[PDB]
Subunit: 220 residues, 4 copies
């Protein structure tokens, strides 16, 4: 495993071990995302958590992922389905895919993630074979056809979109597919500074990273 202080093994650090001093730590997935090599957005832990919760991902399921880097969203999905549920992650741009496979593979040593280079709409997949579809695309409405195709009825597709304008365009686009609009939310984590006697919500905030969109696949 990798260590946070971010390094990949020098030996005082291992002898101290996590929670020990030389301040050595074993990274949380969160810490790891926030310090890993990025070309990405990056997908934030608060958003990826809520996405796994809307997708209703449980162990053993199949989850379809697109697109971009860098394995941030893919790892959260990877733990959610784990064991051998399956993550089929699609990325279009090849050095971003590369970087992501590296990112994921160094933290997560299980092999429940199948990686695919190429747009999701080019790909061929079974009808009604997937337990959820997670998208982190700037133009998600493109894959809507495939997504309704590959997605078991009464399951969700969950898009991640920064701009509300993109969210509206999905919601209209989604009206021409067997998808019923289930949720539109903004996730927010309100950090507090506690350095007693100082105790206030932090002065500078992550005032949202993105909107999460959730469509449910009704039968059609």
């Amino acid at each position: 495993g990798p260590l946070l202080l971010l390094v990949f093994p020098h030996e005082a650090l291992l002898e101290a071990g996590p929670g020990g001093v030389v301040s050595v730590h074993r990274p949380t997935l969160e810490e790891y995302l926030l310090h890993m090599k990025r070309s990405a957005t990056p997908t934030y832990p608060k958003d990826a958590s809520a996405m796994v919760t809307l997708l209703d991902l449980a162990p053993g399921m199949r989850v379809l992922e697109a697109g971009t880097g860098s394995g941030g969203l893919t790892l959260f999905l990877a733990r959610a389905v784990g064991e051998k549920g399956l993550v089929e992650s699609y990325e279009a741009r090849p050095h971003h895919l590369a970087q992501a496979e590296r990112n994921v593979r160094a933290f997560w040593q299980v092999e429940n993630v199948r990686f695919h280079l190429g747009k999701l709409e080019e790909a061929e997949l079974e009808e009604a074979a997937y337990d959820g579809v997670a998208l982190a695309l700037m133009e998600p409405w493109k894959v809507l056809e495939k997504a309704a195709l590959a997605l078991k009825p009464d399951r969700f597709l969950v898009a991640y979109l920064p701009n509300i304008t993109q969210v509206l365009e999905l919601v209209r686009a989604a009206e021409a597919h067997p998808f019923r609009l289930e949720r539109v939310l903004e996730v927010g984590w309100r950090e507090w500074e506690v350095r007693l006697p100082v105790a206030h919500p932090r002065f500078q905030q992550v005032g949202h990273t993105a909107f999460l969109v959730a469509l449910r696949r009704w039968k059609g």
Copy 2:
């Protein structure tokens, strides 16, 4: 498992989302909202295989999340003090989730005993979480987290001060917010009515330690 109509649970037809389940199951009493339970799992840094300590009340709402999170290789030990509705936690959890990764107990922790450094994370929903730090701390592998659910900032403060006595560094205090939007074009706005504040989440991290 059970079914959901649009919107009541029973035994438009839907398999219920775990979150839908928590929101329409017999929630004893002031529920664990999924907004929070999801958060806590994230903070606790849970993966498949791990062992997690949970207390207490009282719908086993948090518990299901814990169950899915750690998986089948992992297991959850759930304590709950209260007797009649620890059962109700058990009724709620076995309806939705039929895996052997949860082992229940009656009682508070301090009365209980447990291996030292066995557990990969602790999750508290107790009114007075400061009572269980000697044990929580003992039970916890170093560098892993204790995550505690608390309605009032006064309780958060007390847990922060009581924790200075044990080998815990405070990493985080946060409120979660899932602001739902309504979108029926041309209408598009944040929902008028919202699950505002449910609780603070204190995350503590075990030192080596000493």
Copy 3:
């Protein structure tokens, strides 16, 4: 002046002292006299006899308890709009809105008795509401009501220090509002749906405004009854987007 009454449960009521009225909060009447003799600050019993606190209502307190039959405007947002408008006393402000009367009332205070608020309502019911609601709380002359729309209003040119709107389709008045507004003074619009905000911004690029702010006021009430101290569980999450625009220098 009207009166706000509260019980120990916290529940508040609005009362208008009327000749020999009586207030019923349960199966127990209170004569209006006791309310008036008690005065802002004191208690009254319902002859059964439940303590009840008498208050003069704060402008805010009045807006939330009046019966509100227009699609209406909150104090958190009205407050913010007065401030975005940069409203100082003596100023002249053009207004168009709902029948709430709230927005007109918040603007009325900002400008003072030496200032002015020309308030326009389109529907004649919607006008009566605003007058009813506005002159119960404030009878000063710095508010003048008009029936109609701004695009059809006859306005002096560059005579106004700000424009406050609470219309469902404000792109429509941007043209009149442009000539009516002094350079570097603002238009501020109360829009519930982000779509309306989006259309207005798109529209505004055709008139001599620069967009300046787009925002959402939140007032997070806390409950404190020690040892209970937290953010109120249920709150007024979202009401409206405020859009602030600036009239370009010179034109």
Copy 4:
């Protein structure tokens, strides 16, 4: 290009942490200030809550601003009387606890003080009944200190609230709440004065 009060407050000379208009707007609304009223103000920063308060009270109203420490009082006065012509403000070089003021003759008390509890008693006197004291406090721990201390004066706690303005960046086709917000400045505490006691 002439400037709005906000803009002035930004290029103004502010020794302390500034006042944000969200907070000052909310402060005026919570005190229920209308044209004509007589309001009491202290003290840190200087002089931007006072400008808001002058606009609120109006033409015929008056704001009594206390600044314990002089060079600040002066800087308050230059700042205020550069932007705000009206002679509707009265500056005092004194603490607010030490000063001597007619009973039940004020329509509010606006404190930006670190030590708000300290002036609790002289406010209960000065402030008419069923009117308000509103305190700006950054920390929840100070809020709590004040909540305990006011239990010992003729005050009911009406309101504790944090004020947020969620800015949006609209730059079509961009449209999204701004990534970096001013997440929190402070809490507002409103106390109501009881009858006689």
